[PDB]
């Protein structure tokens, strides 16, 4: 069990390591963030008549 | 007129008003350019 145990943890590591879509929840709550900002700045420059 | 640096100031240049903190940059310009600008469209730096 011990060893299973062990090992399993070198498995994330190296899934962690060489991915690209493990926390890809928590950038896309930034991502977001940043859209809005991003949207309410970029309206400044209307005219809006 | 002379430039007061460091400091807010209100300044009009040469087809730019406003108030600010007037500093020297690194900013390259190119032999063309008169004055830049920040991702939003807003005043970056000025060329005297």
Redesign the interface.
């Known amino acids: 069990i011990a060893n299973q145990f062990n090992k399993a943890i070198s498995q994330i590591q190296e899934s962690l390591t060489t991915t690209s879509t493990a926390l890809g929840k928590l950038q896309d709550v930034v991502n977001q963030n940043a859209q809005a900002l991003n949207t309410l700045?970029?309206q400044?420059?209307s005219n809006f008549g | 007129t002379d430039l007061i640096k460091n400091q807010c100031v209100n300044f009009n240049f040469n087809g730019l008003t406003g108030t600010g903190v007037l500093t020297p940059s690194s900013k390259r310009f190119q032999p063309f350019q008169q004055f830049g600008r920040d991702v939003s469209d807003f005043t970056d730096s000025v060329r005297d």
């Open positions: 700045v970029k400044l420059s």
